[PDB]
């Protein structure tokens, strides 16, 4: 999964920011959210979010669906490392398992079930 965010921000700057944000907000996790390449649904205006550790994937889906005005017939999937995370998983659990060495979790979203 290629994240444009990494082109825009060198590793050491990301890592320094991620270390600091975890100390300031230990009950939240820092996330980079990007639309998967070629997905035909709406765009966010930011990539970097700071979400509650106890927020579930399902709650995040609900918020994105309403934020980008998805229709009922529109699908919405997340991918972490090209795999759909469980809807019941919390962000904190996904962070523990999948955070990168810059201390961020990376999530792609799409209207398709394959990244």
């Amino acid at each position: 999964m290629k994240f444009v965010y990494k082109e825009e921000h060198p590793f050491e700057k990301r890592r320094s920011e991620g270390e600091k944000i975890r100390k300031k907000y230990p009950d939240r996790v820092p996330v980079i959210v990007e639309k998967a390449p070629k997905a035909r649904i709406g765009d966010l205006d930011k990539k970097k979010y700071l979400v509650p550790s106890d927020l579930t994937v399902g709650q995040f889906y609900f918020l994105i669906r309403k934020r980008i005005h998805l229709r009922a017939e529109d699908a919405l999937f997340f991918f972490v490392n090209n795999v759909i995370p469980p809807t019941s998983a919390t962000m904190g659990q996904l962070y523990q398992e999948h955070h990168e060495e810059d201390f961020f979790l990376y999530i792609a979203y799409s209207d398709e079930s394959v990244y």
């Binding site: 820092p30 930011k46 970097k48 979010y49 700071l50 979400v51 509650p52 927020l55 709650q59 918020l63």
Partner: peptide, 12 residues
């Protein structure tokens, strides 16, 4: 809900 809103997720 009253806590888990879109703005809740915003980077500070």
């Amino acid at each position: 809900d009253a806590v888990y809103t879109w703005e809740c997720l915003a980077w500070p």
